[PDB]
Amino acid sequence: DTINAKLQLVMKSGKYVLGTQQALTTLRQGRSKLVVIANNCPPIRRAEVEYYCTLSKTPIHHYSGNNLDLGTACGKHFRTCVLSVTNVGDSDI
Amino acid sequence: AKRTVKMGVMGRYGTRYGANPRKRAKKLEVSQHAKHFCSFCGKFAFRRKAVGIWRCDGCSKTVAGGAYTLSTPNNSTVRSTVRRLREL
Amino acid sequence: MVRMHGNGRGKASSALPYRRTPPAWLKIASRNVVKMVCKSSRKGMMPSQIGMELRDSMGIAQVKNVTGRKILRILKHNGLAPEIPEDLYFLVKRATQMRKHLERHTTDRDTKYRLILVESRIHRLARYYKRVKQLPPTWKYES
RNA sequence: UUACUCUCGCGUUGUUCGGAGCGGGGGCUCAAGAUUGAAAAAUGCAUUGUGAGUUCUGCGCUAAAGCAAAAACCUGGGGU
RNA sequence: UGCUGUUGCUGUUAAAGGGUUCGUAGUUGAACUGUGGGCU
RNA sequence: CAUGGGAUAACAAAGGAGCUUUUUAAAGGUUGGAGAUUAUGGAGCUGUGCGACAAAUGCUUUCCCAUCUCGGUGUGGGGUUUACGGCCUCUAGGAAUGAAGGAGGGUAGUUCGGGGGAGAACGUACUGGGGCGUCAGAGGUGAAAUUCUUAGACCGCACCAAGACGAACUACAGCGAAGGCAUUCUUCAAGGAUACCUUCCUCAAUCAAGAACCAAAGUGUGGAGAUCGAAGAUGAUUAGAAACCAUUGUAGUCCACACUGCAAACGAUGACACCCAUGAAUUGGGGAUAUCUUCACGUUUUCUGUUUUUUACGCGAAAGCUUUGAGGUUACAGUCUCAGGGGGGAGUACG
RNA sequence: GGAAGUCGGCAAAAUAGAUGCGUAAGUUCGCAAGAAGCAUUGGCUCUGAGGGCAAAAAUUGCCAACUCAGAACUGCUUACGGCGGGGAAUCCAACUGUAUAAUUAAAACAUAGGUUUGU
RNA sequence: CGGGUAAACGGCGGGAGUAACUAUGACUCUCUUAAGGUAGCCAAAUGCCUCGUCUUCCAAUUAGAGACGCGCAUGAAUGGA
Ligand SMILES: [K+]
Ligand SMILES: [K+]
Ligand SMILES: [K+]
Ligand SMILES: [K+]
Ligand SMILES: [K+]
Ligand SMILES: [Mg+2]
Ligand SMILES: [Mg+2]
Ligand SMILES: [Mg+2]
Ligand SMILES: [Mg+2]
Ligand SMILES: [Mg+2]
Ligand SMILES: [Mg+2]
Ligand SMILES: [Mg+2]
Ligand SMILES: [Mg+2]
Ligand SMILES: [Mg+2]
Ligand SMILES: [Mg+2]
Ligand SMILES: [Mg+2]
Ligand SMILES: [Mg+2]
Ligand SMILES: [Mg+2]
Ligand SMILES: [Mg+2]
Ligand SMILES: [Mg+2]
Ligand SMILES: [Mg+2]
Ligand SMILES: [Mg+2]
Ligand SMILES: [Mg+2]
Ligand SMILES: [Mg+2]
Ligand SMILES: [Mg+2]
Ligand SMILES: [Mg+2]
Ligand SMILES: [Mg+2]
Ligand SMILES: [Mg+2]
Ligand SMILES: [Mg+2]
Ligand SMILES: [Mg+2]
Ligand SMILES: [Mg+2]
Ligand SMILES: [Mg+2]
Ligand SMILES: [Mg+2]
Ligand SMILES: [Mg+2]
Ligand SMILES: [Mg+2]
Ligand SMILES: [Mg+2]
Ligand SMILES: [Mg+2]
Ligand SMILES: [Mg+2]
Ligand SMILES: [Mg+2]
Ligand SMILES: [Mg+2]
Ligand SMILES: [Mg+2]
Ligand SMILES: [Mg+2]
Ligand code: NA
Ligand code: NA
Ligand code: NA
Ligand SMILES: [Zn+2]
């Protein structure tokens, strides 16, 4: 998929952070460029993350797989519910 | 090394109850003690407590379904039918 | 695709010319050609795709005839080669999509047969790349 | 917290745990003990160190079998 | 006695191609670095 | 065992960005012999300068930082050359057989097809059921009889239920490794051919051991049960008839999951590669240049890949085969693999 | 002497702990199995291995509780208690279980499995 | 009165002739039932005759085992092996 191709470019060239707590910290600062959320996310946690993105005007993407798929798509061997990319390098988005 | 050739968990029965009845019960015995995938969260952590009751070690969530497996094949068909009729 | 694993006998392919000299109307210096190759790689293109962009829209028929070196050689000198070879990458990607399809459609026996052929192709290819040291030893393919 | 990068790490005798937050530094709290004293020498009779046993306690909590209830008491949400 | 076949057998119908594929030992495996020259 | 020769080959290594030379000058860090002590120097060690010459890849480089008509030549004509500035950085970085009418991968027509999986619907027919009508037979055969029927059979019209199956179009046509695969729409992952001045660079062919798939019948557990129907029942026929024919009917026939591994599983013809005469066709893709409809179709000529047909050399015991070989073989050698050795006993006995 | 006794090996005799080696037919692959069978064992004097705590620390000191293995010498009158005899076959019931208190414990009953009926 | 039903209760045959030595009948007639006992098993805890007949076990076996079967009166969820 097109989103997976860009994640690989970011994973090798840019800068990112994994996990809900670290992603929220980047949103409190101004470094976040894009936030990706898996479809397997607790409803109350998703609503809180989306509220932060609206306040800071950060684009947000709803991933089509669960936290297992999102972790695999990043080359990791663990599950990730939320991803935040602080630096995008050589990528459109 | 491997401790039995044919009967893994039924070896606790010795030579008693007959080969075919032991064989049929083994398939359901293995299923009811395995760990099933949890759609909530992402872990293989669903364990049966009592007949028809499953609890997730990670989610700490309780689901009702299946005497010896988490989801029966008849349940999968029913979910698709209901979703299709709702979309009409 | 044609002979190994199947009965196909197709012959479709390209035929390189006898005259290996770039035309007069091509006025691009070799240094600039190398720059464009490295730029497209950072954008995320594979060597096969890079050569088609230059062919289609830049008038460069063969990079070797202009710069003296092949595209993958240029990327290796600039530290831009892919982690695993390109053809092995695409075969692994195909097998992953087949397996994901098969975990729902468990009775698609034609697809199961095709999965056996693709994985045999992967193991043959990995063996060659380990012998010429383009892959680490103990590299393994996981289903 | 680039912790799991390409044999990831911590831990039990033992069947396992981590981006839904491991390990390290610094802390808050609970349970069971230890120590200092008052009691207490005014009493009793005429000493402080190790091994073995011992269900209080802790290790949080077979099954088509999944392990009583209520009084009494405690805390909170509102209101005064 | 070329009816044991390396030299040198047979396998459509006389005896005899495995139901079809994958595959490890094994056997087999494309081209290329090379026209010496001058004198009667 | 020694030694001469290097054409054909084998072993090992590598996988191609782990990839200057010379000349001068300066600075430091054998004493008579034997036994001790020390110092001066060679030679090499670094770091300074100096002279001379190379370099298979241009440092009068690159990079961004900025700031502003004549002459020679061939036959009076032809062809050949010729007729914004300045600046500061940075600087192993271009020297590597070629891309097999061998293999792998890419992109495209959002290509081609009864290829595979999933979900919704559609179509008549067989059987059964009631609703509307009618009245004496209907069925079946060579001829009959078992069988149904005034308690209304058969026949007629419109419907309802359930389970199978997709007629005509359907062809020496298509897809699939083989077994196999035909209604429509939505959906998932594949496969082959063609086109290419894309990429890569020997990664290949064929096989004991080992693995996967495999019509029908058969087995196990759940469903389903319209049609047909092994076993069985009842009529006939017959010298007899356990059979062929008629009326029925259990297991089955259909679906899911798990076994079994057999077929005239046949082209009775193992796989890969080369050469090879002629004439009409056919399926899919592409290239070049008069017909119909409003982009598709179709004309003519080439081309790659597929299933075939007719009338050459050659081969064969013959029947026959022939670019799709059973040809190119006593003028006997491209590579690998499976099987046979008079007929029975017998694919039997034992393990 | 060794079942010749007796309806009948009734009763008695016999085996015996622990450790090493070894173990058939059959089989629902779990067993059969302690199958069968062979060997050792005392006392005394020694040697080796198995740890905790402090300061190439791959080093130095201090200390506790037991077990196993090996060797020399020296004995038996085989010597508390406690502790399976084994093998080859036929009939019945699958197995654990229940059951006639006071003459019957079994092949009887129950059982999991299979089938049928009513709703 | 007319249909269905046996994992309902239950049931499941007799006579003679016949093959190149004899013996035995694959074969052929005949009376008969709702159907005439199929696969298996046996002198079995089921066989009167009976201590049946052959083999094995012993010096000697009305006992045991393996075979044979016209089975007084074996036999399929009254479940057979
Ligand atoms: K090539
Ligand atoms: K009718
Ligand atoms: K009527
Ligand atoms: K065409
Ligand atoms: K064509
Ligand atoms: Mg980690
Ligand atoms: Mg000869
Ligand atoms: Mg011969
Ligand atoms: Mg033959
Ligand atoms: Mg064949
Ligand atoms: Mg060669
Ligand atoms: Mg009639
Ligand atoms: Mg049709
Ligand atoms: Mg079938
Ligand atoms: Mg069946
Ligand atoms: Mg069934
Ligand atoms: Mg019928
Ligand atoms: Mg019939
Ligand atoms: Mg008759
Ligand atoms: Mg045929
Ligand atoms: Mg054959
Ligand atoms: Mg086609
Ligand atoms: Mg022809
Ligand atoms: Mg020959
Ligand atoms: Mg004796
Ligand atoms: Mg006597
Ligand atoms: Mg006794
Ligand atoms: Mg044995
Ligand atoms: Mg013993
Ligand atoms: Mg025994
Ligand atoms: Mg009993
Ligand atoms: Mg007991
Ligand atoms: Mg008992
Ligand atoms: Mg009693
Ligand atoms: Mg009983
Ligand atoms: Mg039974
Ligand atoms: Mg009989
Ligand atoms: Mg008898
Ligand atoms: Mg006796
Ligand atoms: Mg007997
Ligand atoms: Mg019966
Ligand atoms: Mg009886
Ligand atoms: Na009808
Ligand atoms: Na039926
Ligand atoms: Na019962
Ligand atoms: Zn969960």
Side-chain angles (χ1 to χ4, degrees), chain B residues 51-65:
Chain B
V51 53
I53 289 169
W54 300 79
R55 190 169 189 272
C56 176
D57 294 319
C59 284
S60 182
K61 193 174 287 283
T62 314
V63 182

Side-chain angles (χ1 to χ4, degrees), chain C residues 1-16:
Chain C
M1 186 152 74
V2 287
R3 291 258 70 261
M4 188 214 296
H5 301 163
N7 288 335
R9 268 175 178 87
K11 306 289 177 52
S13 67
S14 57
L16 296 186

Side-chain angles (χ1 to χ4, degrees), chain C residues 26-40:
Chain C
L26 185 53
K27 303 299 194 9
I28 315 296
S30 163
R31 313 180 315 266
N32 300 325
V33 175
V34 173
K35 272 185 53 188
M36 296 195 300
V37 170
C38 293
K39 181 180 146 56
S40 285

Side-chain angles (χ1 to χ4, degrees), chain A residues 33-72:
Chain A
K33 303 302 186 305
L34 170 71
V35 173
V36 188
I37 315 184
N39 62 15
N40 189 22
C41 194
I44 187 60
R45 182 190 296 185
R46 170 164 77 256
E48 182 177 359
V49 170
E50 292 186 332
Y51 199 76
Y52 273 85
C53 294
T54 296
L55 287 182
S56 73
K57 278 169 276 299
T58 309
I60 171 182
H61 182 266
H62 288 85
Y63 197 67
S64 77
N66 57 13
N67 55 343
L68 238 188
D69 302 358
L70 188 52
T72 296

Side-chain angles (χ1 to χ4, degrees), chain C residues 68-82 84-103:
Chain C
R69 35 233 199 274
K70 308 177 189 299
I71 286 183
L72 184 60
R73 184 63 56 197
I74 292 176
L75 300 179
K76 285 180 173 178
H77 289 168
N78 288 81
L80 296 174
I84 76 172
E86 176 184 346
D87 41 6
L88 183 64
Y89 160 86
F90 278 101
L91 283 170
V92 169
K93 179 178 154 197
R94 180 142 77 208
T96 301
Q97 290 163 354
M98 279 171 161
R99 284 195 167 275
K100 174 176 162 46
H101 163 85
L102 280 177
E103 71 186 17

Side-chain angles (χ1 to χ4, degrees), chain A residues 68-85:
Chain A
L68 238 188
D69 302 358
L70 188 52
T72 296
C74 300
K76 311 301 176 176
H77 295 263
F78 48 95
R79 301 161 302 271
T80 100
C81 220
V82 177
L83 186 150
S84 174
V85 36

Side-chain angles (χ1 to χ4, degrees), chain C residues 53-69:
Chain C
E53 307 284 346
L54 304 185
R55 178 195 72 184
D56 283 354
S57 68
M58 287 304 297
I60 301 161
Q62 288 282 118
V63 174
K64 179 174 180 295
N65 294 339
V66 178
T67 71
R69 35 233 199 274

